[PDB]
Design a protein around this ligand. Structure first.
Ligand SMILES: CCCCCCCCCCCCCCCCCC(=O)OC[C@H](COP(=O)([O-])OCC[N+](C)(C)C)OC(=O)CCCCCCCCCCCCCCCCC
Ligand SMILES: CCCCCCCCCCCCCCCCCC(=O)OC[C@H](COP(=O)([O-])OCC[N+](C)(C)C)OC(=O)CCCCCCCCCCCCCCCCC
Lengths: 80, 347, 105, 114, 318, 98, 70, 175, 115
């Protein structure tokens, strides 16, 4: 496959470069470690209003104040 | 034509028809119709002839007008209804525009002014693909919106279609114009019963598709596009004359052949609604269709026309053409009467 | 032959867009979300003929929400009356309508 | 068909937080921190009632608590807040990036004195 | 007071066009080992005034065979279209703050060819027809590349606004992560404005003057100023896109000085380019842009699609 | 409904009467077809923008897209006539009558 | 010699300096010393209309602070 | 007569549509439709559709620049008519302008015309919203969810455009 | 509104220059200055003869590629979406469809010229 690659690199290097960039752009995001970081970065953007919920008295996760430790934090993007 | 490109084109037109079949959105219906258009267009231009270009131009212009009318009907339905579900329409004018669009797409009269030239200017396989596969998607759309269909409009279009198809078929010597006007007559017979029982419409569509495909396969097998060559087929093979006689007797409407199966039961679903004079008038125009069918049968099979001396060479070579499922479709087009209640599988 | 393969294979192709009251990106309601919800939930599964014969009031309210034409007739009538009463000369606009009003915030 | 039932103009007559956009943006984080309870009550009852004719008392309490918070800001840390909202208001896009020193001074003052 | 701002935007760019003609002739002489125009004024400062007055006291000379409607409509539309896309340029604060100024630039750049087509067809001649056909082929060549260049460069910006383009320069120039796209964009700006070696419309050796060969003085000067405003504005746009400078909200003098100097240097580089290379054939124009440019920019477009996902560097849309 | 809706639909039927009555040129009819689609696109976009239907905003442009996907086909159905006839007059297009 | 082009091109620099600077200076006049409030979406427009409705002079650039309330 | 800006732009739209619906010549029809598309894009921009208006602008400019190239290539007559070089072109143009002014006078007088459906004489701004959509535009997330929500639509659109390319290649082969 | 004012001012400045260029100087026309230019000789026929233009497919496929651009253009806002995998996969799919059309053009001799 080396002779064929040398031949196409000698004839038209633009096609070889374009196909190399296309293959890199295809196979690298499937091997990327920061794609899930992009997922939570997009998911953590506060576009609309975070409306509260009614209380039946049984909820261990949601807080009553924004500064309470209960609830999700955003420390991972602050450090990164 | 490249075989891979032709296979891709056929997969495109079947994909467009399937998209029209399976979608619950008006935009996807129109997208499937556009794909159907754009894939059937090069099928007619397989031979690169001026007749094919004229037929393609006429077909493209008529179907484009139909597509724009369909889009205006869809937008009116959206604006008066606020959604896109393929169900009953919420405006009479949207129903008008969609009915005119589907009549233009089908070729129903008085929008029949494009079917005979389009069928004549294209080869036999392209005519088969047109007259069979283009009559499935608009029938599905009319099946979906039959609550909103105006009764007087569809009945007037149906009776005009049958009368105009019979009167057109009375005065054509070419085989393809005969096929086009017979298709208009079958279209009127099929769409007259749409509002009473759409299963009858589906059954008549299936039988018409089987019979028309059988006849176009026989014409492809004999390689004949004229009445005189069809008469000359008697010397090449007698079996071809026997099958053309029995098939063209079947599409006439004679018992005990299969072509009497749909049309008779059309009356069985129109006398229940106390419509008496309309099936009688459509039976009279079916007799007119039977008259030009009888003239064609007199031409081909019942009288052996004089031949030429060249055909002796054709006696030394068997027919090497590929007849795609010819005996099965001939049998289904001839002797399907004793299995009449099988239409209940279409419910 | 409406071959509904969207329910046979369980794949959602175009049910996410076909209705105004569907799931929207970033949870943005349309101008007639509640009327759409009422018209769907009242006319669900009972047939189109019974839906037209029985659920006509909520569909009429939805159509009035969308087209707003009865409100246009109301505004036209009051504006023609206002123009007439100015033209004969027994009406004077208040300072609030004329512009010098000092709005709430 | 039906009739509308609109509230009287006397009930809607309530004093307002007569401030600007940049002043509201400068003290936005501290207002959202200190005054979360009436704002969240108003947002919840507005979301679950979907009727502004029945959603007036919580809006009144939100307005009163906001004006009380701004009065508490005015009593203790007036001049750093004036500098903060002035340099915020100078920017066209109301960017929080171009106001780091003023924000640091404001948060230090309001943490040390309140 | 928007009228004063509009006038101060539209008149000094016409003066810049005139002095661009001055320095064009001077520098173009100077690499050809000769002096430029320096007789009329001190170092030839009065050459553009003489050129402007001379073209406006000649005879318009309308042809008999020319359809007068598009013949009189083409140059005014050309000058307006070269003038009307200056507004979304941040300078450091643009005239009109459009959120989609890139789309406005693209659409008004697509409209700019119509003056060339109408001037080619309005005058009844073979040379104008050939010039119109070559302009059509030039548009075919450059549009399908230029749109993808602008999209792929803009993918790190986050939005179509030109005002937020000055924010992205605050750390590093975008010519460093997109230098190949910078080369593609420079060749595309060479091709669009109809400057050599991509002129192909106002040819001297191939045609006589091409699309305006039948255009006498008065209407002819409008095409001249339209093309020169086009090249100055295109170089300003390239400067803003790739070599954006440091912006301080308390002193716009720094950014005005910096982008003025950078755009002036880029226009000097354009003058340097335009007279060192032979003219390309227009059959090799789409034997290059449709053959060599397009696959490379497709690869770089998909690379810039998949790159912020790779590095977790999704830009904000606001 | 409104006023601009009336203007746009009247433009559509005006362009329809333009298409449905030929004037001996195919490409002029193609221009009238694209005008009918322009009225359709404008009506659909205005209807959506009045009704705040965000998720259906794909449908106008895609509609527009598909129109070009047939309109070029009409252009591709022109030069073939020009590859057989000298011009593209529709009164010369009457070979299919026998 | 070569540097003789350096006068004339400098004039073009002034012709590339007069427009844009003027806009900035115009932005320092109609907006009362501040920049023009760049409105890009509905909420920025709502805040600018809030300033217009609270200023009482029907000018958005007249910004009132915490001294306005008692 | 100020807040009727949408009405005025629609009237210029109908005027240009009547102008190019006479079918005088492909270049002049393209000019008339381009004026019509410009004021239609102005309508869409005046209704907040920046992206849709600019997209229809760019698409129409490209498409009928191609149409200009085609009519200057093949479909050309020796003496093209502008608008008055032939009788029926001017006749149908004046006819269409007369009907246009006919319902203009009908809608500015009684404020309610009845052509198929009923139509009012007020501007469309009365139906436009009183609410604010925050830090974003809704059509932008429409064309953004085009890629995420719109799976089948984008697949069939791309396949149809690819099929259009292969069909247009196959048609003009000759042999 | 300001866009309309800028458009009107630009059109006013444009159409004022040609009016100055036309009605100010003295006109003197005969039946040779208005003649078409054919390098000093009479024109052979008229310029309205149909050009045997050779890049018709290139113009049509420019149109088709511009519609590919129209599909690919709202991509930046899709960068803010939540479902990133479908976004990336189908942006790559559409770019690959563009490349497939271009490669089929390359192989089947479409980018070259007729005659
Ligand atoms: C904008 C900022 C300033 C820009 C520079 C401005 C100053 C310099 C200007 C120079 C003169 C320009 C005008 C004259 C030339 C005009 C013609 C022209 O440009 O033709 C284009 C020429 C034409 O080539 P050609 O003319 O040689 O064509 C011959 C073709 N064959 C060999 C097949 C016979 O080049 C191209 O088309 C290539 C496009 C640009 C390539 C850029 C590559 C960047 C790096 C990619 C990756 C490399 C690493 C390897 C892969 C790694 C993968 C991980
Ligand atoms: C960048 C800005 C550019 C602005 C435009 C250019 C600046 C100068 C504008 C004025 C130029 C002079 C007038 C127009 C050109 C006239 C040319 C000429 O020779 O005309 C001769 C003609 C006289 O010659 P004539 O009338 O005998 O005609 C000559 C042609 N024959 C003999 C064959 C018929 O001048 C005029 O007609 C007078 C024009 C007005 C002069 C001033 C009047 C008073 C104004 C106060």
């Amino acid at each position: 496959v080396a002779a064929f690659l040398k031949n196409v690199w000698a004839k038209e290097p633009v096609l070889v470069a374009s196909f190399a960039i296309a293959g890199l752009a295809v196979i690298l995001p499937t091997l990327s470690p920061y794609t899930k970081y992009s997922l939570m970065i997009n998911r953590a953007t506060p576009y609309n209003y975070p409306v509260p919920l009614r209380d039946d008295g049984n909820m261990p996760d949601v807080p009553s104040h924004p500064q309470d430790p209960q609830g999700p934090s955003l420390e991972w993007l602050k450090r990164l | 034509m490249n075989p891979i490109i032709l296979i891709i084109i056929l997969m495109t037109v079947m994909l467009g028809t399937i998209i029209v079949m399976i979608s619950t959105h008006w935009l996807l219906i129109w997208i499937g119709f556009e794909m159907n258009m754009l894939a059937i267009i090069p099928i007619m231009m397989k031979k690169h002839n001026p007749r094919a270009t004229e037929a393609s131009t006429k077909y493209f212009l008529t179907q484009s007008t139909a597509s724009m009318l369909l889009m205006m009907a869809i937008i009116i339905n959206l604006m008066f209804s606020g959604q896109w579900t393929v169900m009953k329409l919420f405006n009479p004018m949207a129903s008008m525009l969609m009915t005119m669009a589907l009549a233009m797409k089908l070729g129903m009269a008085p929008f029949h002014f494009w079917v005979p030239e389009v069928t004549q200017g294209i080869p036999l396989s392209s005519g088969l693909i047109l007259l069979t596969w283009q009559k499935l998607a608009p029938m599905s759309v009319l099946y979906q919106i039959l609550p909103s269909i105006n009764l007087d409009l569809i009945l007037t279009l149906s009776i005009l279609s049958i009368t105009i198809g019979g009167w057109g078929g009375l005065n054509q010597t070419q085989l393809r114009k005969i096929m086009a006007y017979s298709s208009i007559a079958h279209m009127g017979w099929m769409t007259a019963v749409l509002l009473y029982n759409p299963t009858m419409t589906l059954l008549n569509l299936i039988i018409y598709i089987i019979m028309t495909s059988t006849m176009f396969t026989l014409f492809m097998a004999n390689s004949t596009t004229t009445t005189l060559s069809l008469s000359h087929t008697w010397n090449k093979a007698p079996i071809m004359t026997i099958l053309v006689l029995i098939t063209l007797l079947s599409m006439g409407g004679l018992p005990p052949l299969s072509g009497f199966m749909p049309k008779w039961m059309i009356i069985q679903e129109m006398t229940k609604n106390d419509s008496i004079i309309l099936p009688t008038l459509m039976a009279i125009t079916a007799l007119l269709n039977l008259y030009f069918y009888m003239r064609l049968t007199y031409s081909t099979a019942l009288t052996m026309f004089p031949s030429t001396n060249n055909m002796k060479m054709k006696w030394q070579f068997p027919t090497t053409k590929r007849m795609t499922l010819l005996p099965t479709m001939t049998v289904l087009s001839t002797m399907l009467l004793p299995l009449t209640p099988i239409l209940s599988i279409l419910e | 032959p409406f071959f509904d393969v969207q329910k046979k294979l369980g794949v959602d192709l175009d049910h996410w867009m076909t209705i105004q009251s569907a799931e929207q990106p970033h949870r943005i309601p349309a101008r007639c979300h509640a009327f759409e919800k009422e018209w769907i939930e009242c006319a669900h599964g009972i047939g189109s003929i019974r839906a037209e014969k029985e659920c006509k009031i909520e569909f009429e309210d939805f159509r009035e929400c969308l087209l707003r034409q009865k409100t246009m007739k109301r505004l036209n009538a009051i504006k023609r009356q206002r123009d007439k009463l100015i033209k004969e000369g027994k009406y004077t606009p208040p300072p609030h309508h004329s512009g010098q009003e000092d709005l709430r915030p | 068909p039906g009739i509308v039932e609109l509230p009287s103009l006397e009930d809607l007559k309530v004093q307002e937080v007569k401030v600007s956009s940049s002043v509201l943006k400068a003290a936005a984080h501290h207002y959202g921190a200190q005054c979360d309870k009436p704002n969240k009550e108003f947002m919840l009852c507005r979301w679950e009632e979907k009727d502004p004719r029945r959603c007036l008392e919580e809006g009144k309490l939100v307005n009163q608590c906001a004006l009380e918070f701004f009065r508490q800001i005015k009593r203790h840390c007036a001049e750093p807040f004036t500098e903060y909202w002035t340099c915020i208001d100078y920017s066209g896009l109301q960017l929080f990036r171009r106001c780091r020193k003023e924000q640091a001074q404001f948060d230090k003052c309001v943490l040390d004195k309140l | 007071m928007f009228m004063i701002n509009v006038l101060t935007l539209i008149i000094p760019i016409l003066l810049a066009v005139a002095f661009l003609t001055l320095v064009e002739r001077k520098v173009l002489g100077y690499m050809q080992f000769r002096k430029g125009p320096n007789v009329v004024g001190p170092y030839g400062l009065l050459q553009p005034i003489a050129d402007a007055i001379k073209l406006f006291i000649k005879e318009p000379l309308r042809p008999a065979t020319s359809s007068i409607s598009m013949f009189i409509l083409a140059p005014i539309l050309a000058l307006t279209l070269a003038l009307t896309m200056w507004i979304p340029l941040p300078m450091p604060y643009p005239l009109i703050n459009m959120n989609l100024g890139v789309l406005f630039m693209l659409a008004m750049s697509s409209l700019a060819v119509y003056s060339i087509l109408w001037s080619g067809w309005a005058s009844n001649s073979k040379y104008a027809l050939i010039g119109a056909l070559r302009a059509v082929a030039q548009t075919i060549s450059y549009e399908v590349t230029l749109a993808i260049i602008l999209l792929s460069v803009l993918l790190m910006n986050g939005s179509f606004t030109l005002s937020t383009l000055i924010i992205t320069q605050e750390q590093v120039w975008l010519i460093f992560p997109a230098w190949p796209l910078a080369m593609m964009w420079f060749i595309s700006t060479l091709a669009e404005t109809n400057r050599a070696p991509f002129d192909l419309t106002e040819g001297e050796s191939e045609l006589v003057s091409g699309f305006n060969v039948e255009y006498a003085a008065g209407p002819f000067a409008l095409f001249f100023m339209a093309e020169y405003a086009n090249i100055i504005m295109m170089n300003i746009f390239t400067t803003t896109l790739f070599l954006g400078a440091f912006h301080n909200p308390y002193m716009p003098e720094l950014y005005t000085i910096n982008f003025t100097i950078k755009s002036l240097l880029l226009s000097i580089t354009f003058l340097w380019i335009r007279a060192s290379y032979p003219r390309f054939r227009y059959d090799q124009l789409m034997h290059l842009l449709w053959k060599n440019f397009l696959p490379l920019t497709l690869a770089l477009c998909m690379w810039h699609v998949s790159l912020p996902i790779l590095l977790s560097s999704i830009p904000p849309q606001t | 409904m409104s006023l601009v809706y009336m203007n746009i639909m009247m433009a559509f039927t005006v362009s329809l009467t333009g298409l449905l009555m030929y004037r001996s040129h195919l490409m002029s009819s193609l221009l009238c077809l694209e005008g009918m689609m322009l009225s359709l696109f404008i009506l659909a976009t205005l209807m959506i923008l009045n009704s705040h239907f965000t998720l259906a905003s794909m449908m106008p442009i895609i509609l527009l897209v598909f129109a070009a996907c047939e309109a070029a086909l009409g252009l591709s159905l022109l030069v073939m006539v020009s590859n057989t006839y000298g011009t593209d007059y529709v009164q010369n297009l009457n070979l299919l009558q026998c | 010699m070569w540097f003789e082009v350096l006068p004339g091109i400098a004039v073009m620099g002034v012709c590339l300096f007069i427009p844009g600077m003027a806009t900035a200076r115009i932005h320092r006049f109609s907006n009362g010393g501040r920049e023009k409030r760049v409105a890009h979406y509905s909420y920025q427009w709502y805040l600018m209309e809030r300033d217009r409705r609270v200023s009482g002079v029907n000018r958005y650039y007249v910004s009132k602070g915490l001294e306005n309330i008692d | 007569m100020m807040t009727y800006i949408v009405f005025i732009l629609s009237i210029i739209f109908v005027m240009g549509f009547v102008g190019f619906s006479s079918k005088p010549s492909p270049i002049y029809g393209g000019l008339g439709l381009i004026v019509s598309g410009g004021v239609g894009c102005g309508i869409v921009l005046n209704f907040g559709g920046s992206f849709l208006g600019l997209m229809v602008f760019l698409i129409y400019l490209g498409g009928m620049m191609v149409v200009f190239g085609y009519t200057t290539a093949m479909a050309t007559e020796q003496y093209p008519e502008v608008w008055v070089s032939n009788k029926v072109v001017l006749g149908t143009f004046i006819t269409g302008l007369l009907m246009e002014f006919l319902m203009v006078y009908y809608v500015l007088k009684d404020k309610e015309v009845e052509i198929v459906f009923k139509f009012n004489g007020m501007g469309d701004w009365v139906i436009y919203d009183t609410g604010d959509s925050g830090f974003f535009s809704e059509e932008a997330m429409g064309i953004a969810a085009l890629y995420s929500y719109g799976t089948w639509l984008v697949i069939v659109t791309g396949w149809s455009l690819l099929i259009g390319v292969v069909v247009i290649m196959e048609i003009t082969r000759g042999n | 509104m300001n866009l309309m004012i800028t458009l009107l001012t630009n059109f006013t400045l444009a159409t004022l220059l040609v009016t100055i260029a036309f009605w100010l100087p003295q006109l003197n026309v005969y039946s040779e200055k208005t003649s078409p230019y054919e390098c000093g000789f009479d024109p052979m026929g008229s310029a309205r003869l149909p050009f045997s233009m050779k890049f018709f497919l290139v113009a049509i496929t420019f149109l088709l590629f511009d519609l590919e651009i129209a599909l690919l253009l709202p991509l930046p806002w899709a960068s803010q979406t939540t479902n990133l995998n479908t976004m990336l996969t189908m942006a790559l799919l559409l770019i690959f469809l563009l490349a497939v059309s271009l490669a089929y053009e390359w192989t089947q001799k479409g980018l070259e010229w007729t005659e």
